[PDB]
Amino acid sequence: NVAELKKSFNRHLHFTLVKDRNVATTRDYYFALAHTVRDHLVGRWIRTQQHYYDKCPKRVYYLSLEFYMGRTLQNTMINLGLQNACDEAIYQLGLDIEELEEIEEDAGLGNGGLGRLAACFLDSMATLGLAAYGYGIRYEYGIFNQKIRDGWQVEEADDWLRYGNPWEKSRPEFMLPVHFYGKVEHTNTGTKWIDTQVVLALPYDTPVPGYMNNTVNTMRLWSARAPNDFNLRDFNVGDYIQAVLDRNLAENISRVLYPNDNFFEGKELRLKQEYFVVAATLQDIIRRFKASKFGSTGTVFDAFPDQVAIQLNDTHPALAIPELMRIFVDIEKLPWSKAWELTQKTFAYTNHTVLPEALERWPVDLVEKLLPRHLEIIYEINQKHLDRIVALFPKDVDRLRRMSLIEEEGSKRINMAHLCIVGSHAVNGVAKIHSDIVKTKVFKDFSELEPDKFQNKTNGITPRRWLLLCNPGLAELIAEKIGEDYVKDLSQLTKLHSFLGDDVFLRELAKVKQENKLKFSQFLETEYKVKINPSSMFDVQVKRIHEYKRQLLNCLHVITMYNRIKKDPKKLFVPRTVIIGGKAAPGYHMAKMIIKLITSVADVVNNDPMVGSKLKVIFLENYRVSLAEKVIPATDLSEQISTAGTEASGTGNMKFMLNGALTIGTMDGANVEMAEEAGEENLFIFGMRIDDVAALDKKGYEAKEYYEALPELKLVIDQIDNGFFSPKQPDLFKDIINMLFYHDRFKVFADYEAYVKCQDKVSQLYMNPKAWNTMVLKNIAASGKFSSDRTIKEYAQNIWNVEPS
Amino acid sequence: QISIRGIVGVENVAELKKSFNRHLHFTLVKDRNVATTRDYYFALAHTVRDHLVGRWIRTQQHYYDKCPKRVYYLSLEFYMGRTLQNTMINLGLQNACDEAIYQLGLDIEELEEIEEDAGLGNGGLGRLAACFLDSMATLGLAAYGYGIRYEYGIFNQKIRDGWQVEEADDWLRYGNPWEKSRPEFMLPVHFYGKVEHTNTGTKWIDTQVVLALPYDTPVPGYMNNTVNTMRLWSARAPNDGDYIQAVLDRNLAENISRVLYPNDNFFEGKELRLKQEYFVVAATLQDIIRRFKASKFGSTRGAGTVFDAFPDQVAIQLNDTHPALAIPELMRIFVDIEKLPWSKAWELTQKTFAYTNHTVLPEALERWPVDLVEKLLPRHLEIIYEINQKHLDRIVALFPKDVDRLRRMSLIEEEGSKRINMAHLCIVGSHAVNGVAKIHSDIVKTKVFKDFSELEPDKFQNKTNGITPRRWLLLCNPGLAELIAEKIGEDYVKDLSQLTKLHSFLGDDVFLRELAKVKQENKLKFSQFLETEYKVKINPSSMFDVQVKRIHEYKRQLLNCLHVITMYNRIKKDPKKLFVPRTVIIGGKAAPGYHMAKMIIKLITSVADVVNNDPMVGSKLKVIFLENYRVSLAEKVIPATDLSEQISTAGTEASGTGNMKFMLNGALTIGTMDGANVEMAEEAGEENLFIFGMRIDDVAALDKKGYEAKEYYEALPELKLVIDQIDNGFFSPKQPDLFKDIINMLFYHDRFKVFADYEAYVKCQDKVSQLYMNPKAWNTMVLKNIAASGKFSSDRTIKEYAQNIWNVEPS
Ligand SMILES: Cc1cc(C)c(NC(=O)Nc2cc3ccccc3cc2C(=O)N[C@](C)(C(=O)O)C2CCCCC2)c(C)c1
Ligand SMILES: Cc1cc(C)c(NC(=O)Nc2cc3ccccc3cc2C(=O)N[C@](C)(C(=O)O)C2CCCCC2)c(C)c1
Ligand SMILES: *Cc1c(COP(=O)(O)O)cnc(C)c1O
Ligand SMILES: *Cc1c(COP(=O)(O)O)cnc(C)c1O
Ligand SMILES: CC(=O)N[C@@H]1O[C@H](CO)[C@@H](O)[C@H](O)[C@H]1O
Ligand SMILES: CC(=O)N[C@@H]1O[C@H](CO)[C@@H](O)[C@H](O)[C@H]1O
Ligand SMILES: Cn1c(=O)c2c(ncn2C)n(C)c1=O
Ligand SMILES: Cn1c(=O)c2c(ncn2C)n(C)c1=O
């Protein structure tokens, strides 16, 4: 088995890379290994498809504009049971497998939580044997690579396909046309959408192997191509060369991921992406349905929602609803009511945020020009929707305004969330607190009519990538005590509760953490030229840079610690390495300022000789999935400090819990449920809760009162305001200060005192290894709920109506 | 050739079947139950490429170990066609692969037709490069081809309402199983910026950078151990307003290798074209220098790398002036980067480069505006000026009284907008300059660059073009290849001169029959193709009269067309008279901006509609415009041909290579004494070709006197009828004035004197008709043509370059 892996490796280096070992590159070796590994799942990949054809299980289609997949090599080795053998084979060839793994580019086709949920789900659905496909866009450039230059974020193109992707297979025989612009004619043979521009969607298939089973599912991502055929409407002259160059304009549709996290930008190219992935995906689903054993019978499509479920990852693919209607009515000649019944039973919608700047509201003018037939269909859905509300509440005219899919205020906009609610048989939030707000407040008018529609499905993370892969030390240690059933049923981690008084096991737990810390410290000293204190608490905040996630609040605490040290250098101080990391959306000015502040603080703290090894600050550059795997297992304190009510769930919070970090955080999103499972006393909960925030909004938030009432806050803010951290540019952080005092929607100062006292309690506990690791163990033992396997089981039972196999 | 019989032969087929099935499973990721013909083609291509990896690696090892002088064919074009069949044959695997595919239940022909042409060329220039690579591989020379990996080759041509329309040749849509990317050899290329003159010397600063990423395609030799390489460069944006627009604008850098400029024998001075030329030249020279430094002949001394041995290790052939920037680029690297003195660097440059001239037509000549070059390549403009100055100084020293000679020999044309004459740059920067046939090389030497060759008589040479007898006989015409093998053995494939041995069968009627049958079999096959693509009933006993080449005023498809109408008019005039029936096929792409060429296509299709549908004509005469003429199609139609039309005006066609393909494939030639036609006449005997019309002195005499087209129109009744028909709307009844531009050119601006050769052409055609009625006499002449075609093997051509230009030896 080791011997055969070596032969296979050498075959690929030879035949696939056309390389003698004498001129072989590190990248060649990565590619030879990658192909060797992929060969081992082809059999099951082809047989998984046969199985789905022969037995016709209901299929699940996860439709997302993002899949934040990270690297595939190590994950595939783990899920196929080949890691130990591949490591040994590569070692025997005089090579280091970790070095080959670092060659691989992240498939960074996502922004943050939403896209990473899609990735974990694919892994969970494959492990649970569901007939599930992921459908998205193969962006030529994913989320940008982040560099820091002079303390500022700078963006470089994520050219991830430069050298090829060995994990994908293009299937141009399954290419599909997508239409744009044109016009509508309502003829006597039906409605015709004509004079359209066509863009081709070419699918690329990546295998999604289950963990130690016979399932290999598919992720199918679409790529834009210009069509080749001459239309008699191209008779119209132009330069030949420019016409060929202008093919770029069609191909631009799948060129780059929009790097906005929780923020809507109403750009036309983005709308095209949304319809692009949706039109190609639905056509492909219909083609597979018709070619299946339920493809003939009276109309073939009566069995459709028994054979197809399509999950909408946020409102980004909301156009799927009117497109399915369009295909049913205009092309398949089904009557409206029938089509509409089938549409609702096919689609479910997942809501990921209640922040108003994230909500998709497309101007009707833009949709009219680009997708005239879909506007007509949307207007019709709304008409029949509003007729019913006038029928049920004749006197309530304002309710019609609130429940319409169209917002009429001057420039008219389509509310895509309302489209997703009326077009779906089920709508879910991603944590209890969030799903509650969704149902009872934000879509109150919709839930009162249809209470059974709105559900909760709390998020989760795959314990393959986020334990087995990223933290083998912990995985091995856990498996040695309670066996390895926990991988496929993470609720088994509760059996670790037995070892709470096992002092030898607590030393061994702490040692695994220590080894993870040593190794990441090396990474940090290689990359940042900063001397790391090995016995310091690794205090880590990693996530996209946002005002609501409040990296800024963390930063105020960093300066507070700094100042305390300067005031009394002889005083006892629990040493920390504070790591803050994450990308700012390029056009997000305040996020970019916060980054600059953090790097400005770090430079002052890291180089102050009075501080030395007590406090080091690192801005972690280019935070992404594969770096997430490095830092999270090395963490002691997980910062999850969003203002109560703002973070729908979080998922990084769960990753840290699973890898032996304690959480400091607000009662927000999934933090509440982490407290529920682990016991509130075993997290470091602080600050305002959702009701306390509501009470401060009512009363009116005055930031100045806290700055005057809290001496340590004043010195921190003054240092920032008067140039202590930017001596050559004293006024550099003016935009931040202004925001804090006059426009802070997230109430940083209001939680500052509570946050700082909480941080003191964390330091106390860190001085007591037995107490700390006793608490860590209760966290790990209670983390089973947050496996995405549990999540998918609930989606399967209560929404998709499908069964693990 | 590898065996399919025995214990070992059975195991060869078995192994090919297993490999086929491995690739369909592991590479294509397809069960047989959902596999398509395209999947089967790829599975086979992968299998076939696998079989040359061993030799490809060993060839590179041998070149590293024995360190011979390396040859670098540098071209903007490689018109390669399809690779699958050509590789199987050259590897000796066709019989075995055929057998494997057959046993798997598949149609080998159907799999072969799936393959896209690598149509990265316009015509003869691109195709000569292609033939040359095959020959250099077969002769065992350490040669690389260097080009651009165009995302789109020459456009696919379709005909709509009688006009050419262009569609993008999206040849990489389904991938390319032959190439291998080599990311580690990615190189930077610089553009724009400016020149700084400082204490440390000249710096080229503020440049925008474009990345060149090479892709390698194997070039297998015929039945030897050599697999050489074609390295083609692809343009990429470097990883270093609106973020999204910044990402989208990476397209601008990648546009450098997006599309092939579809001009044949015509200079279009576009900035994107200039970029392409510098791109391929900069990437290539860097990569060549890198290979030189890393080899056993790469030594070190006080300054740095000794490039003393560079010209004994490196020969670079410039295929036309397109990569002329190679000369100042090498000088830039030598002087600006490697710090060699100008004198030494200039001497090494001359010893390294050789230049091949392919056309004397003024409109084809590359003359780049100094303003464009200054903006794009400012340091290269300085180097060109410096080269020119030192070049003029020597001429002033030698000929002090001749003020005009300086003007004529300058690399700069100074009137109006100043332009860089790239041919002059190539002559002074190279130690050898060659034309592509005797007639043409003589014009290059004694007339066009008379001042240059007088100063350096040993510089100018001839190297008459050739074609590879692999693709253009063994591959395209297995029937004829087989027949020749039966009669004289298989040694002709490696020594084409052995075709003269076929003279033993001169009076042998059995063999003359056998030769006719092969031609008939090729005609029957090609007739099928024709009848499924065009609404025509092909007469199978008709003479196949073919003119396939790019549409040009100088190649005179129009003349062919005038003769077609003449024939039509003769049938109408005397319906019951004896007519030797013909299928007249004319095919070729027009450059998209070539107005007159497009009009000529419209004329031909318009004429075809009349002739094909006139019931009085019937099966006597059919006209086909063959759509989308390209290499793989040339391989179908050439073997099916009886008469080859090579009717360019005397002195315009530098060589021609189609002429050679037709000769080798059993067709007789009607043509002028132009290009290699002269040498075809020399080899076969002039009486065995149908030579007609003005020769080069006759065209000179007519130019001096002045050409009055109307004198021929008035003097020749039959021409009058033809021209009046076209002018008055006989062929465009719904648009009577449609061909007004053609008439206007023919009468007042015809640089190629169509009417001047009409009389001699039509009379010559009558003689061809007469001979075709006598099978015994017709095929006797065919035999003397095939038997005399050995000279035109590209092997012969390459040995001559090697011995006289590159100073390397066949192995
Ligand atoms: C164009 C090309 C073709 C092939 C087939 C390869 N891959 C190889 O494996 N090439 C080589 C294999 C060797 C095996 C033994 C000894 C020497 C070998 C050299 C090569 C090779 O390609 N040579 C280089 C890369 C070359 O450029 O020819 C070499 C020149 C001498 C200095 C070291 C680099 C490759 C890579 C390319
Ligand atoms: C996404 C994907 C994955 C794979 C692994 C393949 N390649 C296959 O070989 N797929 C199939 C193998 C089968 C083997 C036996 C019986 C049925 C099989 C079906 C497939 C298959 O994937 N079928 C298609 C392509 C499917 O996508 O379900 C189906 C689509 C509708 C038209 C008829 C073909 C492929 C091709 C894709
Ligand atoms: C887990 C993950 C996220 C989500 O992080 P949150 O703290 O829940 O917002 C974002 N980016 C990457 C790379 C991740 O792995
Ligand atoms: C050989 C060839 C040519 C060159 O033909 P000429 O008659 O010499 O101009 C042009 N196009 C193709 C496809 C060829 O194979
Ligand atoms: C728009 C968006 O990405 N929302 C995010 O979705 C993920 C996955 O549900 C949540 O963990 C997170 O709280 C939420 O902010
Ligand atoms: C610029 C160009 O493509 N010239 C062409 O070159 C080929 C190959 O040398 C000749 O056969 C042909 O006569 C000539 O027109
Ligand atoms: C104001 N603003 C932005 O401008 C922005 C953003 N995310 C991306 N962008 C551009 N967020 C979250 C934001 O609040
Ligand atoms: C005038 N003209 C052109 O304009 C042209 C051309 N080949 C391409 N083009 C555009 N030729 C040969 C030509 O004579």
Q: What is the DSSP string of A218-246?
A: EEEEEEEE---PPPTTS-S---HHHHHHT
Ligand 1 atom closest to Cα of residue B144 = 1
Q: Residue B185: helix, strand or coil by DSSP?
A: helix
Between chains, do B165 and A241 touch, taking CB under 8 Å as contact? no
Which residue(s) pair with B157 in the sheet?
B166
CB distance B326 to B285 below 8 Å? yes
3-class state of residue A339 by DSSP: helix
Return the DSSP state at A407: E
Is there a single domain that holds both residue A356 and residue A427? yes
Nearest CA to B520 among B624, B666, B627, B664?
B666
* Whether A79 and A39 share a structural domain: yes
HEC profile of B170-183? CCCCCCCCCCEECH
Residues in the ligand 1 pocket, defined by CB under 6 Å: A 18-20, 22-23; B 56-57, 60-61, 64, 216, 229, 291, 294-295
**Ligand 3 atom 4, closest CA:** A113
Out of B29, B173, B180, closest to residue A18 by CB: B180
* CA-to-CA dists, residue B133 to B56, B74, B331, B437, B654, angstroms: 14, 11, 27, 19, 21
Cβ <8 Å between A27 and B165: no
Alpha-carbon dihedral of residues B389, B391, B397, B401, nearest 10 degrees?
-80
Q: Which residue of A has its CA nearest to B247?
A: A157
Same domain, B552 and B412: no
Contact across the interface for B244 and A228, Cβ inside 8 Å:
no
Chain A residues within an 8 Å CB radius of B60: 20
Chain A residues 132-151 with CB within 8 Å of chain B: 141, 144-145
- Token look-up 């945020």 returns A353
**Same-domain check for residues B87 and B228:** yes
Smallest Cα–Cα separation from B489: which of B477, B479, B501? B501
> Does the active-site annotation cover B440?
no
Name the residue with tokens 């059993």.
Answer: B666
Sorted by sequence, the CB contacts under 8 Å of residue B693 that are 6+ apart come out as B647, B650, B672, B673, B756, B757, B760, B761, B764
CB A96: neighbour CB atoms within 10 A? Answer: 13
Name the 3-class secondary structure at A361: strand
* DSSP-derived 3-state class of residue A397: helix
**B231 φ, ψ (degrees, to nearest 5):** -105, 110
Residue B152 has what DSSP assignment? B
Whole-Å CA distances, A269 to A143, A158, A160, A274, B808: 16, 19, 21, 9, 57
Selection from A648, A456, A579, A674 nearest residue A665 by Cα? A674
User: Is the Cβ–Cβ distance between A69 and A139 less than 8 Å?
Assistant: no
Nearest 5°: the CA angle A456, A462, A466 is 130
Q: Tell me phi and psi for residue B437, to 5 degrees.
A: -175, 155
C-alpha angle B345-B349-B352 in degrees, rounded to nearest 5: 140
**H-only helix segments in A545-615:** 551-567, 589-607
3-class DSSP assignment, residue A455: strand
Of residues B25, B152, B184, nearest to A244 (C-beta) = B152
Q: How many domains does the structure of chain B reveal?
A: 2
Can you tell me the distance from the alpha carbon of B472 to that of B722, in angstroms, rounded to the nearest whole number?
37
Look up residue A368 and give its DSSP letter. Answer: H
Are residues A631 and A619 part of one domain? yes
Find the residue in A nearest to B183 (Cα). Answer: A163
Rounded to the nearest 5 degrees, what angle is found at the Cα of B588, between the Cα atoms of B479 and B537?
65
Catalytic residue among A543, A583, A624, A747: A543
Distance from CA of A250 to the nearest CA of B (A): 12
Print burial letters for A721-753: b (CB count within 10 Å at least 16), e (below 16).
beebbbeeeeebbeebeebbeeebebbbbbbbb
**Full residue range of the structural domain in which residue B61 is found:** 1-466+794-811
Same domain, B443 and B558: no
For B333, which DSSP code?
I
Longest Cα–Cα distance of chain B, Å, equals 89
Whether residues B165 and A230 touch (CB distance < 8 A) is answered with yes
Q: Give yes or no for a contact between B213 and B233, defined as CB atoms under 8 angstroms apart.
A: yes
Same structural domain, B458 and B484 = no
What H or E segment, with its residue span, contains residue B656?
A: none
| Calpha distance B297→B294 (Å, rounded) | 8
Distance from Cα B479 to the centre of ligand 6, integer Å: 29
- Give the span between the Cα atoms of A398 and A413, in whole angstroms: 17
Sign of the four-CA dihedral B493, B494, B497, B498: negative
Assigned token pair, A296: 């003939």
Backbone CA torsion sign across A40, A42, A43, A45: positive
B166 touches chain A (CB under 8 A): yes
Catalytic residue among A453, A544, A576, A592: A544
Return the sign of the alpha-carbon dihedral for residues A368, A370, A376, A381. Answer: negative
- Measured CA to CA, the distance from residue B41 to residue B18 in angstroms comes to 15
Q: Does the CB of B180 have a partner CB in chain A at under 8 Å?
A: yes
B247 and A255 in contact by Cβ < 8 A? yes
B482 and B775 in contact (C-beta within 8 Å)? no
Q: Is B104 helix (H, G, I), strand (E, B) or coil?
A: coil
Q: Do A46 and B57 touch (CB under 8 A)?
A: no
Interface of B with A in 571-600 (CB under 8 A): 592-593
C-alpha–C-alpha distance, residues A462 and A133, integer Å? 17
Contact assignment for B160 to A241 by CB distance below 8 Å: no
A608 residue type, one letter: D
Residues 6+ apart with CB under 8 A from A488: A127, A211, A212, A789
Written as one string, the DSSP assignment of A598-633 is HHHHHHHHHH-TTTGGGEEEEEETT--HHHHHHHGG
B102 touching chain A per CB within 8 A = no
Give yes or no: residues A454 and A472 share one domain: no
A309 plus A456 within the same structural domain: yes
Q: Please tell me the distance from the alpha carbon of residue B769 to that of residue B252, in angstroms, as a whole number.
A: 56
Centre of ligand 5 from the C-alpha of residue A253, in Å: 24
B550 part of the active site: yes
Sign of the four-CA dihedral B701, B427, B135, B285: negative
Domain of B285, CATH number, reads 3.40.50.2000
Residues β-bridged to residue B71: B143, B315
**Is the same domain home to B497 and B438?**
no
Of the listed B352, B464, B657, B672, which one is catalytic? B657
Three-state DSSP class for A177? strand
Cβ–Cβ under 8 Å, residues B666 and B155:
no
Tokens 């093998």, residue?
B485
Report the C-alpha gap between B126 and B319 in whole angstroms: 9
If you search the block for the tokens 């069968």, which residue do you land on? B505
Structure tokens given for B712? 């021929």
CA angle A740, A742, A745 (to 5 degrees): 65
Say whether both A246 and A295 belong to one domain: yes
Q: Which of residues 236-265 of B touch A (CB under 8 A)?
A: 236-237, 239-240, 243-244, 247-248, 250-251, 255, 258-259, 261-262
Measure Cα distances from A390 to A399, A404, A418, B771 in Å: 9, 12, 17, 93
The verdict on the CB of residue A49 being under 6 Å from ligand 2 is: yes
Under 8 Å between Cβ of A190 and A330: yes
CA B332 to chain centre: 31
Is residue B487 annotated as part of the catalytic site, yes or no?
no
Beta-ladder partners of A503:
none
Alpha-carbon gap, residue A145 to A34, rounded angstroms: 23
CA separation, residue B503 to residues B389, B484, B496, B663, B689 (Å): 58, 12, 14, 15, 17
Contacts of A240 in chain B (CB under 8 A): 155, 166, 262, 592-593
**Strand-strand pairing, B314-319 and B353-356:** parallel
Q: Are residues B675 and B780 in the same domain?
A: yes
Does residue B547 line the site of ligand 6, with CB under 6 A? no
C-alpha to C-alpha distances, B342 to A108, A280, B286, B345, B394, nearest whole angstrom: 50, 61, 19, 5, 15
Sign of CA dihedral B680, B681, B684, B689: positive
- Separation CA A256–CA B245 (nearest Å): 10
Q: How many beta carbons lie within 10 A of that of residue B77, not counting itself? A: 28
d(CA A261, CA A116): 12
- Spatial separation of the C-alpha atoms in residues A698 and A693, rounded to whole Å: 9
Resolution in A: 2.6
CB under 8 A, 24+ apart: contacts of B4-9: B4/B95, B4/B96, B4/B99, B9/B96
Return the axis-axis angle of helices B775-787 and B758-772, rounded to nearest 10°. Answer: 110
A357 lines ligand 7 (CB under 6 A): yes
Name the method of structure determination: X-ray
CB A94 within 8 A of CB A54: no
What is the distance between the alpha carbons of residues A758 and A573, in angstroms, rounded to a whole number? 15
Gaps after which residues in chain A, C–N over 2.5 Å? 297
Q: Spell out the residues 6+ positions from residue B786 whose beta carbon is closer than 8 angstroms to its own.
A: B480, B484, B499, B502, B663, B664, B666
Distance CA B181, CA A227 (A): 26
The answer for residues whose C-beta is within 8 angstroms of residue B454's C-beta and 6 or more apart is: none
